[PDB]
Every structure is written in C-alpha cells, then in structure tokens.
C-alpha cells in the first residue's frame, strides 16, 4: 500500500508538463515496487483495460526486457500513453515499425538493420558530427543568450540521422522539419501539428531514397541488398520513420538535461571541462532518462518478483525510476560523470529491443558537450526550463540560457 494520492496515474501527461514524479517513484521502490496503477474508464491514454502494473526496480525492468516471448511489444505497442480518445487502429499502425514488433518479424528486421550500426558505420560519422557540434556551439555562444534547446540541443541529433542515412545536404531542412513533427504532440504548443502527415511525407522520401540507391559503400546500400536478407523499399521507409522518432527528441533531451545537471552540479562541470571523460555520456543519459517509460503486455500469466501478472495485462517499465534504483546505483541522486560501471536502462533493459542507436547517441552527446565546454564554458541559465506535456517522453521544450555567464543572476 504506497502513499500516493487517490487515482494517481504515473502516465498522466499533466504531471510531466510540470515535473518528474521523483518522490512518487521513490515511494513505490521503497513500499510497492510493482504496483497496480488503476485507470478510470476513458482515462487510460488509449488503453481500455483498467490500468497497468507500474514497474519501478531495475532488476524487474531487465527481467521483463529479457522475456520478450511473454512480455510482448506488438500486442499493445510500447508507448503507454496517447490522447484518451485515440482510435485503436492508430495504436495498431505503430506495429509497422520494428520497435512494436515481436519475433519472428522483429528478429529478421533487427538482424538486417544492425548492419547500419557497426563500429565502422558509426565511426564514419564522427568527424562530420564533431565539426557540426563545434559550429553549433560557436554560433550559439556568439548570440550571447537564447533558447538552449533550439540553439544547442536540437540540431546535432538530426544531423546524426542525416549523416547515418547519407541524406543530401539540400534535403536536410525538409527531413528535419518532418522529423520534428513526428513525436512530441500532446502539448498545447504543438496541438496544431499533424504527425501523421509528416510521417507520410517522410515515408515517401525514404522509399525513393531506397529506389534510387539501388541505382555504393554506405548504410542504405547495405540494408537494401541481400546479406540472404534485405529490407524492401517499404521496410526501409518504416526504418527511416522509426529513426526519425527514436533518435531525435530522445538525444535532444539528453543534451538539454545533461546541461541542466551540469548547472546544478558545478563541480562536475568544472571536472568535465578539464577531463572530458567519455563516461559522461552514460551518466547524462541515466540522469536525463529521455524515455520515461515503455510498456509491454503479458501474453501469459507470469510471476514477477512475487507478483502474479496475468495474461493480457500491461506492465509499464519506468526507466526513470529504475535509473535511480538505490540497490543498484551508489547514491543515484548525485550526478557523477565518472560513474563506472553505469548499468542504467535509459537505452532499455538488455534484450531484443535494446537501443540499436546507443553508441551513435553517446557519440553525439560526447561531441556536443566537448563543443559546449570549448565555446561556452561559463554558461548560466536565465530562467527555468519549460517541460513537455507527454505521458512517456521526458522533454524540455525551451530553456533560456546566457551562454557567456556574464549577465546578472
Ligand atoms: C539518448 C538518446 C536515446 C535514448 C534514451 C534511446 C532509448 C531507447 C529505448 C528506451 C529503446 C527501447 C529499448 C527496449 O525496448 O529495450 C530504443 C530503441 C531504439 N532506438 Fe534508441 N534511444 C536514443 C537514441 C537513439 C538514436 C540516436 C537512434 C538512431 C539514430 C536510436 C534508434 C533506435 C532504434 C532503431 C530502436 C528500436 C530497436 C528495436 O526495437 O529492436 N535511438 N531507444
């Protein structure tokens, strides 16, 4: 019996528009580490099953992640919150991306797409991203002050996707426009955006890219040629839509919130500026936990840590709670860029769906923080961050920063 308000719902977007429910997750870890989060009829974020099991401990997140025959991604998809009135068919179309597939379909697609994320493929992007990171941080610093989210955090993740896919320089503006429309839409600031339209345009663009690349040594060629497996044009289209969501706002929020952590822990920022430890990226992702939660649905009864999960019930893995698990991390509430080992689940629990982009993301994070250290070492915030209204993505919309640190306060 945890101490929470009547009807509290850990996927309620109205919570995340204002704060992370840190105290409430700590309460569950302590008192009810697997807890039934009931949901009133019509208040289930698109699911009409009465609620879900909140999973708060790291070991439980890993156990659910491993057992993908029991804990399905396909059955209800992995996003645990949409608009309450969403039609079921709009939840089910998510099954066209590999993140919402189970074996065998997932297994085939994962094996093919892994070609795009080899050490060689990712390292080939390094120098361009480093150069781009340097210019992003210089141009921002020269502006004196501005919105850190737009002027520092947004562009590099987009350029990492563009560089991975070999998107022509002239096509990057339109690619980025579509991609920025494809996630974060539950907030009134973005209420007028139609993600479905952008997703359709991206698919059309990507399918042509496949068409034409059949007509080189690059990731797109490798994906659409027999290894004997290959993506069809449409499988490529859905792979690109998946990246446009999986790898954009996530990395962006890691950058914003990693900078917010440095502002809050100036001794760590001083240490970072001197040492530039590559371990910083993992601590940044643990602290930022850009995906608050993903869900699964049990396909059979399963006893998890002494709790009887029943066939059909959803389990929601709160990576935001697991990443602060007092039994796993030493003093998880302090930000330590040298933390090592750092067994966080910000990229998922180990398992079939573990973030395929994780090394690309760490590289993007490390390059942008190097550039920030280089060009704006004295930065200070001007005002509090503005959070995103979403029941599953932990987002910062805007954050006004004085890059020079010279302004008062
Ligand atoms: C800090 C930034 C990022 C975070 C926090 C993040 C987090 C995650 C998480 C939690 C999952 C699901 C893991 C699971 O269910 O076990 C995932 C899957 C995925 N991520 Fe990332 N990710 C990030 C960056 C990226 C980037 C940069 C890319 C590619 C450009 C990417 C591509 C993908 C893909 C394609 C999947 C689906 C893999 C599958 O279902 O087999 N991610 N990510």
Curated annotation (Swiss-Prot):
Pfam families (alphabetical): p450
Catalytic activity: cholest-4-en-3-one + 6 reduced [2Fe-2S]-[ferredoxin] + 3 O2 + 5 H(+) = (25S)-3-oxocholest-4-en-26-oate + 6 oxidized [2Fe-2S]-[ferredoxin] + 4 H2O; (25R)-3-oxocholest-4-en-26-ol + 2 reduced [2Fe-2S]-[ferredoxin] + O2 + 2 H(+) = (25R)-3-oxocholest-4-en-26-al + 2 oxidized [2Fe-2S]-[ferredoxin] + 2 H2O; (25R)-3-oxocholest-4-en-26-al + 2 reduced [2Fe-2S]-[ferredoxin] + O2 + H(+) = (25R)-3-oxocholest-4-en-26-oate + 2 oxidized [2Fe-2S]-[ferredoxin] + H2O; cholest-4-en-3-one + 2 reduced [2Fe-2S]-[ferredoxin] + O2 + 2 H(+) = (25S)-3-oxocholest-4-en-26-ol + 2 oxidized [2Fe-2S]-[ferredoxin] + H2O
Positions with a binding annotation for heme: 355
Top class in the EC scheme: oxidoreductase
Coiled-coil spans in chain: none
Chain sites annotated for binding substrate: 184
Result of knocking out the encoding gene: Cells lacking this gene appear to metabolize cholesterol normally, probably due to the ability of Cyp142 to compensate for loss of Cyp125.
Family: Belongs to the cytochrome P450 family.
Protein name according to UniProt: Steroid C26-monooxygenase
Annotated organism of origin: Mycobacterium tuberculosis (strain ATCC 25618 / H37Rv)
Gene field: cyp125
């Amino acid at each position: 019996s945890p101490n929470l308000p009547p009807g509290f719902d850990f996927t309620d977007p109205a919570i995340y528009a204002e704060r992370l429910p840190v105290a409430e997750f700590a309460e569950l870890r302590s008192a009810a580490p697997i807890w039934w989060n009931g949901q009133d009829p019509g208040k289930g974020g698109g699911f009409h099953d009465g609620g879900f099991w909140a999973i708060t401990k790291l070991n439980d997140v890993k156990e659910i992640s491993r057992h993908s025959d029991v804990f399905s991604s396909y059955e209800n998809g992995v996003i645990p919150r949409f608009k309450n009135d969403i039609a079921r068919e709009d939840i089910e179309v998510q099954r066209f991306v590999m993140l919402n597939m189970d074996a065998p379909h997932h297994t085939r697609l994962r094996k093919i797409i892994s070609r795009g994320f080899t050490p060689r493929a990712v390292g080939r992007l390094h120098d361009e991203l480093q150069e781009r990171a340097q210019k992003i941080a210089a141009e921002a610093a020269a502006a004196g002050s501005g919105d850190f989210v737009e002027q520092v955090s947004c562009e590099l993740p987009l350029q990492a996707i563009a560089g991975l896919l070999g998107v022509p320089q002239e096509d990057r503006g339109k690619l980025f426009h579509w991609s920025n429309e494809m996630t974060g839409n539950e907030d009134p600031e973005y209420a007028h955006i139609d993600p479905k339209a952008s997703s359709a345009e991206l698919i059309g663009y990507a399918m042509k890219m496949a068409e034409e690349k059949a007509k080189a040594d690059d990731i797109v060629t490798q994906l659409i040629q027999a290894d004997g497996e290959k993506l069809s044009d449409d499988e490529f289209g859905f792979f690109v839509v998946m990246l446009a969501v999986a790898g954009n706002e996530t990395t962006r929020n890691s950058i914003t919130q990693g900078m917010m952590a440095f502002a809050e822990h100036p001794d760590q920022w001083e240490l970072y500026k001197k040492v530039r430890p590559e371990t910083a990226a993992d601590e940044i992702v643990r602290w930022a936990t850009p995906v608050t939660a993903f869900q699964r649905t049990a396909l059979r009864d399963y006893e998890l840590s002494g709790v009887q999960i029943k066939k059909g019930q959803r389990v929601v893995m709160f990576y935001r709670s697991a990443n602060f698990d007092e039994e796993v991390f030493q003093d998880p509430f302090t930000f330590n860029i040298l933390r090592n080992p750092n067994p966080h689940v910000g990229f998922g629990g180990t398992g079939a769906h573990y973030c395929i982009g994780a090394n690309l993301a760490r590289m993007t994070i490390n390059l942008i923080f190097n550039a920030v250290a280089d060009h704006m070492p004295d930065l200070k915030p001007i005002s509090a961050p503005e959070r995103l209204r979403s029941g599953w993505l932990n987002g910062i919309k805007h954050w006004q920063v004085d890059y020079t640190g010279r302004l008062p306060v």
